[PDB]
Symmetry: D3
Subunit: 102 residues, 6 copies
C-alpha cells in the first residue's frame, strides 16, 4: 500500500563450489548491513538456484533509482565486494525496473 | 523462511503494454486473494525496455508454486495474453537463503 | 562419435505456431533426404513457451553443416518463415564426446 | 512425442576430462538401466573448452522425473559437485512429430 | 581504463528492417555530428537473424553516455521506433583496456 | 566491400587471472592488427561492474578475414596463454555494419 514505483534490481552471481557458504554469508552481510543502515533500501533477498548449486541471485528493492545509486556508493556494498573479490563471478544484472502499481 | 522464488519474463508488442500490465496485475491480485501458498506477486516493467515485463513471485514452497500453476488465475491470465504475449521465460526458480 | 551438433532457437507469433512447425519439419525431412552429411534433424517445441521452437541438428562434421547452410532446403525454410519468425539464435555448436 | 532436455555446464579448465568422464558415466548408466531414457549425448562446445552440453531424450516427461530421482544422476552429481557450474537448463520440450 | 563502450541489442518485425536501420543511422549520425563526447556509434545487423540489430557505441566516459541519453537525438530515435522495436537490451557496458 | 564484419566475444576468468587475461587479450589484439591485413579493429573491454568478465570487439574486412584470423598463429598463441583458466569464448554476435 502506497509504495509508489519502487526500483527493482536483480543480480546474478556464480561462485566456485567451495565458496557456496562464503558467498551466502557475504550476501547476507550485504542484505543485513544495507537494510539496517540505508533507509532507501527496502528489501534485499539472497536466493539460491534450485538446481545450479554455484549460482546465486540478489533480489533488491529500493525507494527509487537514486536510492540504488546511493547504495552503490555506501560502505556495505564496498565491504561486500571486498569479501567476494577473490572468487565471485559477477555481478550480472538480470534487470533493473520499476514496479507496476495496482 | 526458506521461501520459493520464481522470476518470469514476458515480452509484448508495443500496443499491448497497457493490456499486459493489466493482465499481470490481475494475475498478481487474483493469486494473492485465492492462493494461501502464494505470498508475494509483483509486476515489474524494465527500466528501459518498454516491451519487457517481469513477474516476481514468492511461494511457501515448490508445491505451492505447482498449485498456482494448476489454478484458475494463471489459466485466465494466459487466456488474456496468449494471442500477443511472448513467454513465459523463467529467469530462475530458487529458495531464499535464511539469515 | 565426434559428430557435429548444432542447436538453434526460433520465436514465432501465436498464429504462426503450426506454420513454423510445418516449415521446420520440411527443413528436417528435406535435409535428411538430400544431404548425406546431415545425420539427424529434430524440431522441438518449448514445454512452457508455445511460441519458442528449437532445431536439434547433427552432422558428419562442421564442413557438412556449412554445406547444409549453402544448400536449397534451408533456403526454402527461410523463405517460408521470413515474414514472421524470429531467428536463428544458435544456442551452441559442438562435437559429441565419444564413449 | 519424446521429451527432450538440454542441459549446460561450465567447468574449470583442469576439470574438462573429469567432467567428460562423468557425463559419459551418466549417459551410459542411464541408458543401460532406465527404460524411459532413450538417448543421452555429451557435447563439448566447438570453441568454449570449459562448456559442455547434455542432450537427453526420454519417452515422456514422467521418464525424465524418474531419471531425476534415480541412482545414476546422483552419482553423476557426486562426481562433479566439487567444481561444476550448473545445471543450467537450456530447454525442456517435446519433439514435433513428423 | 580509457573509453566507455556500450553494446545494445534490438529486435524488430520483418517489415520494419529498413525502418530500424534508418532510425539507428539517424541516431548514429546525429549523435556523432552533434555530441563531442560521443566517439563511435555503429549499427550492426546480425549475420543470420534479419530481425536483430546491435548498436556498438563508444563514449569519452560514462558521463558522456549519460549526457547522450539526455539529448534530443536519442529521444527522437525512440519516437521513431516506439511502435515496433523491441529493446533496448544492454549486452554490456564497460571500459577499454589500454595497451 | 561496403560492410565490415563485426565479432563480439565474451570471456570470464578466475579472480586472480584478470591481469593475465588483459595481457593475453592485448597480445591477441596487437598481434592481429600488426600481422593480419584483413583485421581492421581489435579492442579488449572490461565489464564496468563484472570484474571477472571481459569482451573482445573485433572488426574484419569480411567473414573470410575472420575465418583467416581463426586459422592464424596469433589466436593460437592467445588460446595457449588462457588455456589453463579462461572460460569462453562465448560469441555474443557476428554481424555486418549498416552504412549511412
Amino acid at each position: 500500500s502506497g509504495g509508489g514505483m519502487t526500483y527493482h534490481v536483480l543480480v546474478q552471481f556464480d561462485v566456485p563450489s567451495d565458496k557456496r557458504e562464503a558467498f551466502a554469508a557475504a550476501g547476507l552481510f550485504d542484505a543485513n548491513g544495507s537494510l539496517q543502515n540505508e533507509p532507501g533500501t527496502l528489501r534485499f533477498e539472497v536466493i539460491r538456484d534450485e538446481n545450479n548449486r554455484n549460482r546465486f541471485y540478489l533480489d533488491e528493492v529500493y525507494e527509487d533509482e537514486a536510492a540504488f545509486l546511493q547504495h552503490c556508493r555506501n560502505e556495505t556494498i564496498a565491504r561486500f565486494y571486498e569479501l567476494i573479490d577473490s572468487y565471485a563471478f559477477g555481478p550480472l544484472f538480470l534487470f533493473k525496473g520499476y514496479r507496476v502499481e495496482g
